[PDB]
Amino acid sequence: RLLEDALIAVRQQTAMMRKFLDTPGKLMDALKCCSTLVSELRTSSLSPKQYYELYMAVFDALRYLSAHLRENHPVNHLADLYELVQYAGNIIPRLYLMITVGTAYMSIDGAPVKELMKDMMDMSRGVQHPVRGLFLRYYLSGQARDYLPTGDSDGPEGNLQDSINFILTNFVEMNKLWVRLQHQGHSRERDLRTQERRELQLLVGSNIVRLSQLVDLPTYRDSILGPLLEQIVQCRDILAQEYLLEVITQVFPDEYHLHTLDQFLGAVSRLNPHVNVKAIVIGMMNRLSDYAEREVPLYDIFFDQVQHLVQAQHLPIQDTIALCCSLANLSLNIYPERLDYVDGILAYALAKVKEHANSADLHSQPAQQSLLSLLQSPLRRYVSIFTALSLPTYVSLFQAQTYPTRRAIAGEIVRTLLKNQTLISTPAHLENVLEILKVLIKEGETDETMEEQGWLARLVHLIHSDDNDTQFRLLQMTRKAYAEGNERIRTTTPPLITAGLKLARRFKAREHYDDNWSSQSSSLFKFLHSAISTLYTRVNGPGVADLCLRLFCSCGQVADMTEFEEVAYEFFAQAFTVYEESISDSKAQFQAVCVIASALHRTRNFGRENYDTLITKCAQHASKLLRKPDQCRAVYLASHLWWATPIAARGETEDTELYRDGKRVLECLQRALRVADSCMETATSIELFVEILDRYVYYFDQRNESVTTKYLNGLIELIHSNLAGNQQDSASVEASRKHFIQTLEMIQ
Amino acid sequence: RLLEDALIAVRQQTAMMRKFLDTPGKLMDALKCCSTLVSELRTSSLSPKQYYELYMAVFDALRYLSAHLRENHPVNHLADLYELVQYAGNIIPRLYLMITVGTAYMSIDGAPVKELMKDMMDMSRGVQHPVRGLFLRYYLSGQARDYLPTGDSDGPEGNLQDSINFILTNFVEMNKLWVRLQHQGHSRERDLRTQERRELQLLVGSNIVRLSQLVDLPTYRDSILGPLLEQIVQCRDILAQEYLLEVITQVFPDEYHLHTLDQFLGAVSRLNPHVNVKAIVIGMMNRLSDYAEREVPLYDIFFDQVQHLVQAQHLPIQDTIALCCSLANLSLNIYPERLDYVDGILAYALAKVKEHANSADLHSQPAQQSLLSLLQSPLRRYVSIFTALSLPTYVSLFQAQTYPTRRAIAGEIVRTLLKNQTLISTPAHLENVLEILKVLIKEGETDETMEEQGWLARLVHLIHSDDNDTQFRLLQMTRKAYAEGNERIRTTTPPLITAGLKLARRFKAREHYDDNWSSQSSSLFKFLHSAISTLYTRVNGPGVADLCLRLFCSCGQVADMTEFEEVAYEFFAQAFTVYEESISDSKAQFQAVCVIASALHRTRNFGRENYDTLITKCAQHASKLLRKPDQCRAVYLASHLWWATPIAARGETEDTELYRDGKRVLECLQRALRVADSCMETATSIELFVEILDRYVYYFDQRNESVTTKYLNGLIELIHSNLAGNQQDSASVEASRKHFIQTLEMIQ
Amino acid sequence: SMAFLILVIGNLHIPDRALDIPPKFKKLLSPGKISQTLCLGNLTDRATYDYLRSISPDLKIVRGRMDVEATSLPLMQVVTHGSLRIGFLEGFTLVSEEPDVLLAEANKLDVDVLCWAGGSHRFECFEYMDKFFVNPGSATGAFTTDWVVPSFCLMDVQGISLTLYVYQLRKDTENVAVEKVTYTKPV
Amino acid sequence: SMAFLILVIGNLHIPDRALDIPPKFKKLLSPGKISQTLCLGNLTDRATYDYLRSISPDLKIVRGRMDVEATSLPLMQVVTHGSLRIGFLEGFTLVSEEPDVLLAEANKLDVDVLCWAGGSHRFECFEYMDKFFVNPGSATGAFTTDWVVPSFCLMDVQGISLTLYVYQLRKDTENVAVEKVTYTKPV
């Protein structure tokens, strides 16, 4: 390439220039070498990237040139070679000649700097080439970076004022190139020319980089508010002001900026709609964020500023909501605690934008992601959003989201509400959760329960945090809040059952302090039944009824424990009933009546019209079956009116004693045995004998009278005999004989 | 095409023939023109359709020819011209003029007719061409039609045998050209020439027509029947046999067929197999039907003909059985009288011919259709059923009948019996209908009630239609027949319940004449309870056993009404048992214990030692029901165990009043009171209190010695206060108030 | 009106304990006459239900003591034509036809009409305590199941009145009867 | 060895009468500690099964009441550490707690280790009639049916000896508690 050839040539040129400078006394040929080397620098045959590489090469060589400057040139002088070689109409050769002279002079003495610098700037009127102008002024800045005066400003040519003047004029003229550079040349070159612009922005920002160590806030604002802002209003280039305000943000102590960024915003509210105003704004907001929450109602001022802006702009969904959520985070930075204004942003800034945004359903628009981020920003932000949860204009904003956004926010909210555990709640949470649920499955395999099941669980569980008196009213809230329709409450109810039923105990903790606890307990029974049918209202589902059956059973034993057991009686009956509805599976009822028996067996406080009655009723239940062994099982399980069983029977219905019905249930057992005699199977009969002798010795050792040792000895011998005498082998037989000899040991 | 030219030539020939006929004396020229006329058709180029059209044209022409002939020429004669033109070489005009002059002679000369005809027939032998021979002979016969030498000629020139010769020669020549018509013209024209044969066969049958104008049975069977059957078996041609014989049969009157059947049937039974002998013998049987249906074992002889042609031919089973359908119809036209003959040949012989014919699968097989038609033939032909009910062996035929036809015929015969009263079933009748049944239900949507719902209803009812005493053994035979299997009589046992129950009192009604009514009554009771437990033993009823309950109840109630307390006490104990075994659904349990109540209720004379024990068991099991409101319902009906109610409790020692133990009544009244105090439902309890009020006030008006007006006042004031103080608005509340008003009016 | 052929009839214990109605009623009770048939239930089979639905599109089917399968059909039902309230049910609650219990259940029903199945098939009628007492009977009076008249009456209900046309098929030789003993509600 | 820590974790009742284990003890259930987890059924919710699968290296369960769909999962499961026939259950199948009737059923299933978590929900252990009794109460620490501490036990079963480290979270402020119990089977 031309780049390679030019680099090789200028490399040999700087090689001989080193031969000149390292061996002193050759100042004339060295100056001529520098002049002819910059003669190739006016040759712009190097593409701006190639030109950039060659300029970096000559710039690192030129740092050594400036070292040789500081080492040799401070001796006496260099006299007006610029005007002496001025004979040609050209400018750049003698230009850089006297420029090297001025770099020497600034290397020695700080006084002559401003004189020769204004000389260069004035005689630069002949340089119509803006690219060479920018390259030159950048060279001067990077050079005079170590030579531009500072707070030691004392009055010689070159001071803070004069250095900022020099750097500012070089900056703005390099800006003038940086603009034309996008457009100088052929019109079709605009793409590569924007490339040049982007490549050389930092070469101009170096001016501000040097401005970093410079004028304080008053001087700052005065010296900067005018000139560069007018440069901005004149260029109207996006990348220009973008990079500019970027370097500004990072350049001065922002006690300067933010005390000016207010009126700076007031000035720069002028931006065109096709200019990337939002990037500017969000970079500002970045400064303001790591300003504030890094551990002038900027709300008012800056919010109204951006109000004007979006009002002056025409921000579609995307830019609008991007700036919206950025504003959200920004308020979360500056005024977390000035919440009033934050919920103002919510309602009369952000909700008014929301509806004011007359944009149809939009998810491909990432602006919805921005709004979701926005909504969760104080969620994601507070450790205590329950504080903001006390705001509806926090939550009442939610209708303004669409079904997909709705359950998005649903997943987010449930996350919020699952990680935490609920404290003392006024009805307020109940408002919040009305919202939640009416968003939840309202309006109209659940692959992820999404997430309502694990949700509802922890929902009703945190609900237990509530206290008794209002717990019933909010139980109302819950229950009918579950007026959604059918195929959900299977995923719901037992929790709810339990909620009511343990509220029974919480309430009952005041029975020594109440009589209306009878009436409030009524209120319970009512609401119980309310839910109960509410689910019985839902018969359509498989395997879910049996559940509510058991649930009814639980409420029953509850009231049993609530000592106001007047009605659990009725629960138990209607439980049998809804069984008789729910009769479809064998093993189902098997376990079902098993549970019936367990529960009732754990019931010992009812009166005979309940007590003995229900005994007979469950006896019936048992009797009402189809297949033998399991039946017999439950049968002899149900044996509990008269004698010793079980230890848990600490009951004063029989003087701390046990009730193991002996004789009647015994004849029922004999009934079952003869019925089983109709089976004609070996292992079944084996079992039969097993449980037979089990309960036989169970009576004899527990002092049961009519179970005499004669029956038992004769029958165990009979079982052993017919077992051995007419029954074929199977491992069951031998394990049973083992069990049997064990029982013999246990006969005592 | 040439046929049209022949037709126009014949038209012009008839034109010149008319001209020559209208001129007498030129009748010789008329005969010349007629010979030219017939020469046009003499060629075999005229297709038998157009040949016969030309033949009828020339035939009407020769009709006028022979008319004008018999007018002009037979004035004396033509002198022996028959022989003068009998030897000349030119044969055709010779023969045509000869037949014309023979026609003239037959017109004028009645005696020499047979000589002329026989000589013409003899000279017809020298030619072996059948076309000209047949058509020439048809012309001659059409001339000789009106003067056959026959039974009208009683011995002069012509007799029976003379017409015999005439017609038989005509007929055999007809048959000669007729069978040649299967081979006339082209060989590949078989179907067409046979169609032409069929077109011309009417000319053949014309001889049969002429024969029908002749002698009666005797001289026929003498001189013609023999020859008739002779030609019948001598044709030995499928088409000749078929067509000619069907003509014969259709033609000749039955005075001939009086004694000429059997040998004729045998002659037919040995003819060609390619004949549809089935159809023609069916037509014979249809003539036989024309005989029978009008109000020497031709029955058996004809069956022998049947068997012979079964052997002499190769009969498809289908054809056979269809013929048998027709035979059965004919025979049950013949001997419905002592049908034993008929059923002999049909079942005992013809049905055996079937079981011989081991038919392959046949429903779509028309053998099956002939099957069903034959089988129903007696059944539909029957006017009274014990004709069939006398047929004991169809039970095998039942097996010999195929499955769907089995069902069809069985439903047929049964409902035929059913449409009106059936009679007592003799043993054979019994096991026959039992066979019917154990084929139907046994062996093995109720759009058929498959199938016997009404059928078993009518069955069990007509069981009563039988003889009083045997009805018991009939019960036993039927309960044997009521072994259809564990899964068949499920709900149609209540019929046999009815049977036993009615027979109970029926046989009870014979005590004035046999004391075994008590012993055999007990024996019944045993057989009954057997059957009843059996349906208990149909434990496989899905809790549905309220029936068997009701049936035991009916039985025991009648037993006590038949005053058999012994097992009445026993069988009501059994009712107790199965009750508890069956006591199943709240609502159900209710109704069923009501049934048990009524079971008690209807008694009058039962022993009190058992009565009061039953009272105890009742009150117990009543108290052994479950649900509260319905329970107190049970309670108030349970006190009828004591009160001046029911029919059970009406003693004539009570001064026509009833048992009236109003004390325990009021006791259970207090019980139900307590219970209603605890149902935990306002309005139901209220209405129930009203009901109890009604009980008490009726007893007051019924004068219960235990009804205290203090209880009146206490309860009514309690209720009046509650309805005034605590009754919640509802319509049933108004019902309570108004009926309370009614009660107040009733307080007296 | 012949649009009100209100009839209490039937009850032959079928298919169990009869065979079928003879052609007499069959043609007397064939389609084309009755627009409103009054059912007494406990047939007990299905085909007769079909036939009775065929008799009129206006029936009142009830479960009876021999009616098991349709566990659903309750036993009582009331209808009203004008000011007459036609209540009806089994009567199982009764231990005897004690007028107190009868009128009491009627008041539970708010009816003056009497239809049931007792034990006997025995009719009687009279007035006592504002109500009249009419036995629904059977077709020709089948055997003992209802506290023996052939029960069927061309009954039009008007206001408080029912035109009871007491008709029987009495044996002497079952013969059709055309007689009337009418009752109207006292109110 | 240190291979099979036999925790007695059960009485889940989730969401039946419980939802979550105390956080300390729940995270005490992190995988990699034991390859052996002893869940005893009626978990119930599907999420319980999912988190179990994610958390549990061992799947051996008994069949449970509140459990509608996976009614296929066995009534019980026998285990052997060293040489032991191990029986585990809830205690629901019997009407009572009678250790002798319990070991009766055990012999009907042939296991010498006897562990359960029934409906009175207590911790107590001892031997009577030559067999050992294992019930810890509500291993989930839920409220009982009676008038609880979550009780899972580092049961150290190899050979015929059992060492029991029960971790207990009882409130005075909650308190994590450990009790050490040792049991050696009579072989």
Numbering used by the authors:
A (entry chain A), B (entry chain C): 12 to 306, 387 to 535, 554 to 857
C (entry chain D), D (entry chain B): 0 to 146, 153 to 177, 181 to 195
Relevant lines from the article:
Retromer is a master regulator of cargo retrieval from endosomes, which is critical for many cellular processes including signaling, immunity, neuroprotection, and virus infection. The core of retromer is a trimer comprising vacuolar protein sorting (VPS) proteins VPS35, VPS26, and VPS29. Here, we elucidate the structural basis of membrane tubulation and coupled cargo recognition by metazoan and fungal retromer coats assembled with the non–Bin1/Amphiphysin/Rvs (BAR) sorting nexin SNX3 using cryo–electron tomography. The retromer core retains its arched, scaffolding structure but changes its mode of membrane recruitment when assembled with different SNX adaptors, allowing cargo recognition at subunit interfaces.
Cryo–electron tomography revealed the architecture of fungal retromer core assembled on membranes via a membrane adaptor, a dimer of sorting nexins (SNX) containing Bin1/Amphiphysin/Rvs (BAR) domains, in which the core trimer forms an arch-like structure over a layer of SNX-BAR adaptors. BAR domains are known for their curvature-generating/stabilizing properties, and the accepted dogma is that membrane curvature enabling the formation of tubules is induced by the SNX-BARs, with retromer core trimer playing an auxiliary role. In the assembled retromer:SNX-BAR, the core trimer does not contact the membrane but is bound to the SNX-BAR adaptor layer via loops 5 and 9 of VPS26 (6). In retromer:PX-BAR coats, membrane bending will be enhanced through the well-established local membrane-remodeling action of the curved BAR domains. The core trimer arch—the conserved architectural element of the different retromer coats—forms a scaffold that can contribute directly or indirectly to membrane bending and which propagates curvature over larger areas of membrane by oligomerization.
